[PDB]
């Protein structure tokens, strides 16, 4: 389940497609919890592409449902990312994740 609540401004039409490299200012937040990951810290805003399953499924479907300049707010279900397994020391099992995602991409 990918739920999008867009902070409005952008263009709403430049949609990310397969074979396109995109740049995302992400910041992870735990539900009823603190931060765990932030692209604001290292200031290298994580160049990546679409079509290789490099990211998790909850973040991947959130990438295609956005456009340039937009600011979304993800809500990742446990079963698509880590809920059965849990990322060791960083994500406990059966965890629901919140991401602050802004898409300022290229290509």
Coordinates of N, CA and C in Angstrom, one line a residue, residues 18-90:
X18 N 10.8 4.1 -16.8 CA 11.9 3.1 -16.7 C 13.1 3.5 -17.5
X19 N 14.3 3.2 -17.0 CA 15.5 3.7 -17.7 C 15.8 5.2 -17.4
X20 N 15.2 5.8 -16.4 CA 15.4 7.2 -16.0 C 16.0 7.2 -14.7
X21 N 17.1 8.0 -14.6 CA 17.8 8.2 -13.3 C 17.3 9.5 -12.6
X22 N 16.9 9.3 -11.3 CA 16.2 10.3 -10.6 C 17.0 10.6 -9.3
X23 N 16.8 11.8 -8.8 CA 17.5 12.3 -7.6 C 16.4 12.7 -6.5
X24 N 16.5 12.1 -5.3 CA 15.5 12.2 -4.3 C 16.1 12.7 -3.0
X25 N 15.6 13.8 -2.5 CA 15.9 14.2 -1.1 C 14.9 13.5 -0.2
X26 N 15.4 12.4 0.4 CA 14.6 11.6 1.3 C 15.0 11.8 2.7
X27 N 14.1 11.4 3.6 CA 14.3 11.4 5.0 C 13.3 10.4 5.7
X28 N 13.9 9.4 6.3 CA 13.1 8.4 6.9 C 12.7 8.7 8.3
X29 N 11.4 8.3 8.7 CA 10.9 8.6 10.0 C 10.2 7.3 10.4
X30 N 10.4 6.9 11.7 CA 9.7 5.8 12.2 C 8.4 6.2 12.8
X31 N 7.3 5.4 12.5 CA 6.0 5.7 13.1 C 6.1 5.5 14.6
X32 N 5.6 6.5 15.4 CA 5.8 6.6 16.8 C 7.2 6.4 17.3
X33 N 8.1 7.0 16.5 CA 9.5 6.9 16.7 C 10.3 8.0 16.1
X34 N 11.6 7.9 16.2 CA 12.5 9.0 15.7 C 13.0 8.7 14.3
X35 N 14.0 9.4 13.9 CA 14.6 9.3 12.6 C 15.4 8.0 12.5
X36 N 15.6 7.5 11.3 CA 16.6 6.4 11.1 C 17.5 6.6 9.8
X37 N 17.0 7.5 8.9 CA 17.8 7.7 7.7 C 17.4 9.1 7.1
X38 N 18.4 9.8 6.6 CA 18.2 11.1 6.1 C 19.3 11.5 5.0
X39 N 18.8 11.9 3.9 CA 19.7 12.4 2.8 C 20.1 13.8 3.1
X40 N 19.4 14.5 4.0 CA 19.8 15.9 4.4 C 21.2 15.9 5.1
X41 N 21.5 14.8 5.7 CA 22.8 14.8 6.5 C 24.0 14.8 5.7
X42 N 24.1 13.8 4.8 CA 25.3 13.7 4.0 C 25.4 14.6 2.8
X43 N 24.2 15.2 2.5 CA 24.1 16.2 1.4 C 24.4 15.6 0.0
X44 N 24.4 14.3 -0.1 CA 24.6 13.6 -1.4 C 23.2 13.0 -1.7
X45 N 22.4 13.6 -2.5 CA 21.0 13.2 -2.6 C 20.7 12.0 -3.4
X46 N 21.5 11.0 -3.4 CA 21.2 9.6 -3.7 C 20.7 9.4 -5.1
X47 N 21.6 9.6 -6.1 CA 21.3 9.3 -7.5 C 21.0 7.8 -7.7
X48 N 19.8 7.5 -8.2 CA 19.4 6.1 -8.5 C 18.5 6.1 -9.7
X49 N 18.3 4.9 -10.2 CA 17.4 4.7 -11.4 C 16.2 3.9 -11.1
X50 N 15.4 3.7 -12.1 CA 14.1 2.9 -11.9 C 14.2 1.7 -12.9
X51 N 13.8 0.6 -12.4 CA 13.8 -0.6 -13.2 C 14.8 -1.7 -12.8
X52 N 15.4 -1.6 -11.6 CA 16.4 -2.6 -11.2 C 16.0 -3.2 -9.8
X53 N 14.9 -2.8 -9.2 CA 14.6 -3.2 -7.8 C 15.7 -3.0 -6.8
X54 N 16.4 -1.9 -7.0 CA 17.4 -1.5 -6.0 C 16.8 -1.0 -4.7
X55 N 15.8 -0.2 -4.8 CA 15.0 0.3 -3.6 C 13.9 -0.7 -3.3
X56 N 13.3 -0.5 -2.1 CA 12.2 -1.4 -1.7 C 11.0 -1.1 -2.6
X57 N 10.0 -2.0 -2.5 CA 8.8 -1.8 -3.3 C 7.9 -0.7 -2.9
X58 N 7.8 -0.3 -1.6 CA 7.0 0.8 -1.2 C 7.6 2.1 -1.6
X59 N 8.9 2.2 -1.7 CA 9.5 3.5 -2.2 C 9.5 3.5 -3.7
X60 N 9.5 2.4 -4.4 CA 9.5 2.3 -5.8 C 8.2 2.8 -6.5
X61 N 7.1 2.3 -5.9 CA 5.8 2.7 -6.4 C 5.5 4.1 -6.1
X62 N 6.0 4.6 -5.0 CA 5.9 6.0 -4.6 C 6.7 6.9 -5.6
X63 N 7.7 6.4 -6.2 CA 8.5 7.2 -7.1 C 7.8 7.5 -8.4
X64 N 7.0 6.5 -8.9 CA 6.3 6.6 -10.2 C 5.1 7.5 -10.1
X65 N 4.5 7.6 -8.9 CA 3.3 8.4 -8.7 C 3.6 9.8 -8.3
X66 N 4.8 10.3 -8.6 CA 5.2 11.7 -8.4 C 5.6 12.4 -9.6
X67 N 6.0 13.7 -9.5 CA 6.5 14.5 -10.6 C 7.6 15.4 -10.1
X68 N 8.1 16.2 -11.0 CA 9.2 17.1 -10.6 C 8.8 18.2 -9.7
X69 N 9.5 18.5 -8.6 CA 9.2 19.6 -7.7 C 8.3 19.2 -6.6
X70 N 7.6 18.1 -6.7 CA 6.6 17.7 -5.8 C 7.2 17.3 -4.4
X71 N 6.4 17.2 -3.4 CA 6.8 16.8 -2.1 C 5.8 15.9 -1.5
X72 N 6.0 14.6 -1.5 CA 5.1 13.6 -1.1 C 5.3 13.2 0.4
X73 N 4.5 12.2 0.8 CA 4.7 11.7 2.2 C 4.3 10.2 2.2
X74 N 5.2 9.4 2.2 CA 5.0 7.9 2.0 C 4.4 7.3 3.3
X75 N 3.8 6.1 3.1 CA 3.3 5.3 4.2 C 3.6 3.8 3.7
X76 N 4.7 3.3 4.2 CA 5.1 2.0 3.7 C 4.6 0.8 4.6
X77 N 3.9 -0.1 4.0 CA 3.5 -1.3 4.8 C 4.6 -2.2 5.2
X78 N 4.5 -2.9 6.2 CA 5.6 -3.8 6.7 C 6.0 -4.9 5.7
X79 N 4.9 -5.5 5.0 CA 5.2 -6.7 4.2 C 6.0 -6.4 3.0
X80 N 6.0 -5.1 2.5 CA 6.7 -4.8 1.2 C 8.2 -4.5 1.5
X81 N 8.5 -4.1 2.7 CA 9.9 -3.7 2.9 C 10.7 -4.5 3.9
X82 N 10.3 -4.6 5.2 CA 11.1 -5.3 6.2 C 10.3 -6.0 7.2
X83 N 9.0 -6.1 7.2 CA 8.2 -6.4 8.4 C 8.4 -7.9 8.8
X84 N 8.6 -8.8 7.9 CA 8.8 -10.2 8.3 C 10.3 -10.3 8.7
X85 N 11.2 -9.6 8.1 CA 12.6 -9.8 8.4 C 13.1 -8.8 9.4
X86 N 13.1 -7.5 9.1 CA 13.7 -6.5 10.0 C 15.1 -6.3 9.6
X87 N 15.4 -5.0 9.3 CA 16.8 -4.7 8.9 C 17.6 -4.7 10.2
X88 N 18.8 -5.4 10.3 CA 19.4 -5.7 11.6 C 20.0 -4.5 12.3
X89 N 19.4 -4.2 13.5 CA 19.8 -3.1 14.3 C 19.1 -1.8 13.9
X90 N 18.6 -1.7 12.7 CA 18.0 -0.4 12.2 C 16.5 -0.5 12.1

